[PDB]
Amino acid sequence: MKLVIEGTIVLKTGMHIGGSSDFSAIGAVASPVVRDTLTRLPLIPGSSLKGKMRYLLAKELNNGIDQDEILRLFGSSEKDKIRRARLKFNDIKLSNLAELETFNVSSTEVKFENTINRKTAVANPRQIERVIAGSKFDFEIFYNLDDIKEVEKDFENIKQGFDLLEFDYLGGHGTRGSGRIAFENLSVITAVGNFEKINTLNEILGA
């Protein structure tokens, strides 16, 4: 009655999530990415993944009219609607950094962009830190099972959020190149409480 969904976020294009203001290196004129504070390795926040899945899932649903699927999956606190969220997202850290060290390359890069003014034809450059493509982020998200009559529709909505996110980006300047992700190795294992139909969730998410 408490489920674990494991997977990996690989990056087809680079990613600029977030920014620290911790005076780590703010001297360089480049907007930095969010990193772990004791390893300084690149990090996907669980709030970013959670919020972008909620945004795309609530935009694909709720068309022409949030509904209780989104609130029961992601939690809500209104003046009369208070629900516990069923998904427990965790902050995701970089996985294949040894594989990124086989190629003698960094865990993160810097991307240069200009901005050509149309009146005066002049470029001002700017820099963006990105975590590079080919980076992989092993994640696990915890689902608690309040009611068995809703778990299959919840997992259908979770896979809908995952491939909707696979046709969008994950944070940052995604319209101008970056942010594109791909979820792989999506599998479900039950943590506590034996669940009698687990393979149907493992195939509705692993498809």
Place this chain on the structure above:
Amino acid sequence: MKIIKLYFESPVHFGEKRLSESKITFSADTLFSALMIEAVGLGKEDEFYQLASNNLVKFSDAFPFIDQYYYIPKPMFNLKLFKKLLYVPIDSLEDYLSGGLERESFNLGKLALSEKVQQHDFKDSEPYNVGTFTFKENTGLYVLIEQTHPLLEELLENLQYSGIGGKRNSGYGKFKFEILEDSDIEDLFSAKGNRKILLSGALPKDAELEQALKNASYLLERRGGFVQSDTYATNLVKKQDLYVFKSGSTFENSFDGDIYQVGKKGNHPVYKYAKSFFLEVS
């Protein structure tokens, strides 16, 4: 007496009055509330409150540990004859008390601040910020229990895959737990002494408060907040403020606390574990 070592796999957030500010460790109120929420998840909160009220489970505040070294807060001794010191190891308490004795530095991790936004489509987005704390690689927290019960272990294992602290569903708080029954700490706890050091955020009942405050060096701590449930009062509401003693306090007379009720005007009660947990020294 057993231990519950909590090795964290994620940043934590254990705020005091904030979302932007955090502390390095949590208290027995929070762990009791978390276990009670995991009990109502699986329908055993009547059994768990009857275990906890009858002193079948008794757990202190969670305290730091670095490599094979269990730490406790700097006990407020009222001795006559280290202000930046906050945590002294639990085994070194006798020769910390016998003289002015610093042997190694205390490092657990460091605080952080996550920068998050609340994105709007047709409106300027709202920034907010979550103060966190990341442990070091081979550090964590431990909780002292005695005469453990299978319900406590089941509730701990359910809390393991749910999160401890605040903003747990938004990326924080996951851990793993282990019992690891020790021999030196239990021998340190079984020995009696003239002066006893509190170890949980306790508050004596109204017929023993005068007896508790005899030769006492305490520190009151306001422990309240908002009620976290769904079936309480159909809107967010703050529980009753309870002022308990801080966990580093030191007393002459013993007491046993109570699990006080801080929520009364709702569909279910809200409890606050202020039971007492003592360590004897001389």
Place this chain on the structure above:
Amino acid sequence: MDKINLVCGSLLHNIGKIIYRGTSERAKHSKLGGDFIKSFEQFRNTELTDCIRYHHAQEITSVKSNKEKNSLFYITYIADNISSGMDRRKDLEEGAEGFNWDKKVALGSVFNVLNEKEKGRQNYSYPFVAEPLNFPTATQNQYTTSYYDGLITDMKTILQRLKPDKEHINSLLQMMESLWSYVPSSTDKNQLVDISLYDHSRTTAAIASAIYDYFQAENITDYQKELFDYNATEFYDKNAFLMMNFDMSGVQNFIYNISGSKALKSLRARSFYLDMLLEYISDNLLEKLELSRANILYVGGGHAYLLLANTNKTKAILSDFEHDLKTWFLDKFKIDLYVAMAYTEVSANDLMNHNGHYRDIYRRLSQKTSAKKANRYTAEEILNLNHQGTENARECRECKRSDLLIEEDDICEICDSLQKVSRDLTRENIFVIANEGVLDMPFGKKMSALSYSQADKEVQIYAKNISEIGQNLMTRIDMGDYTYRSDFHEMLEEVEVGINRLGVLRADVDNLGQAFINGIPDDYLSISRTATFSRAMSRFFKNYLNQLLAEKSYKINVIYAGGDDLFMIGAWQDILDFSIVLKQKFADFTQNKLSISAGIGMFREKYPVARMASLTGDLEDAAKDYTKNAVTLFDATNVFSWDTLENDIFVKLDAITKNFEKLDETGKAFIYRLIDLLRGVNENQQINIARLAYTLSRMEEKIGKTFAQELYNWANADRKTLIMALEIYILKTRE
């Protein structure tokens, strides 16, 4: 007989030193001071005249039998003797025929005695100025007869407008503080040369009042036999004094732990609230004990010290005052504020350091204050704390409590009052405490912070700066209230060259406690020397820090000022500019006998203020690890000293801003490139320094030939000084 004649005499004797140093008459100074009060201030109060004229042993034994007993000058005599710190019986009176008194000795500093064992003894003096800034110079200063004549004429203009009464003692103390703060107490060798006339006179009036109250409660008339039938040994050995203290706890938690989005605008209001709260609490207790304000030895940041009589009536008033103050603080600030009133019994031989034990006064007082802080509350107060908890779906925005909320907006009343007074705090506002006001206070009084014509109003008026001393009749209380603009977004928009970040300076003097209880040698200990050291340190920090900040108009808001804790915030460039001049002027003030450790931190404007102050303080304790001369520049790993910062960082930054202003566009890209790879070899790999050996051959010609005169010698083996100077250069040069 009475008390007020004794208090005004004990303040007002020893004026014949400033009379005798300004004329050609060669009488004894007691006769000249008595003739000055009797002749000019045209009313002849005999207790006043005999308290001024007869306060040395020779004139006392001259007029002893024909002058009455219980005559109030024995208290003045023994109070001068105790306050001086040593015996003044066989010492000849200043201005007599038996000695050659030079009437132009300058006032020495208290700092040339402090830390004498390890830093050495000095001989500095205060040059005379006719506020403003006055520093002890290493030259033989000498005053002038014109200076003392000017002081005599100022006393003539300012004493004719007063009258010895209960309401004029504050004006008389402000007279002494304004004029006599730089004239010396004695013109001989170093007995009382470091001690000003104001500090000696204030201390002797405080202990004169204490001795008078102790004698009135123990109803011993005929003071003559009990202070002259022996050498007053029996009086010296009995506990006739109490030295109590106030100690506010959680002051930093009150100032910095505020959760508001606009919490930066209330820091000065909260710091002001706590300081003026302690001021009024101490002044109210002195009102209840019928003692003057001269019995305040030091009312400082978070704590106060009072000397007061060891009578049972005093202890009854103290117990009632402590209970009422405790109940009021519980009923407003539940745990978040606490005032610890602890007292100890001290004696005159213990005050005079005759048998040691002068350290033991403050040791016992700190022990009893810590014991009171350990057992903060009673059982009934804890029960009433737990009984008042309710359930409610409302909370303040800023101070986040759910009691004393206003019905129209979710805000705590005291916290809203801090908002209002933050809106009404200027550079000239005086502060008025009455029954009706803005800011809630004990004891049923409230404070308005109004200026200026609304102060024509029963009331106590607290001003930072006084206009006229005598007639206008208000009490001068100073704090480090320098604000540049009182709004951080606008002053951050004013600066245009550097990065748009807010800079926080947190500093403290190294070892206030050690230099305060055992910094002075044992053979120079006195109550007046402790008074003049505390007044010198507080005077520097508040008044001098305000005047240095107003001199060069830095973009700096000061939140807290004091030796124990300092906290300023503003434009980070002006923080970095003012830190070095603060260290330099503190070293000029204290003659390098005390060290100051700072920590800088740079943040956005919308950074959380509590986390800002907390991690600026953790960079502070990172500097204090190294309690030496140490500055942490925006991070806990970038720890320097003051001399390294001063000399090396500023000549390096001036050189870099000189030769790097060619300008060039991709030259800046080269600057960031070399900074990043110097940090890369600062990650401790020597293949990177092989790369940098290859790199210098690439980058000679980019800046030209100005590299190979000083830059290559700094970049020899990846100096931290060079990368920090380049870092602050590229931070000072942005959009």
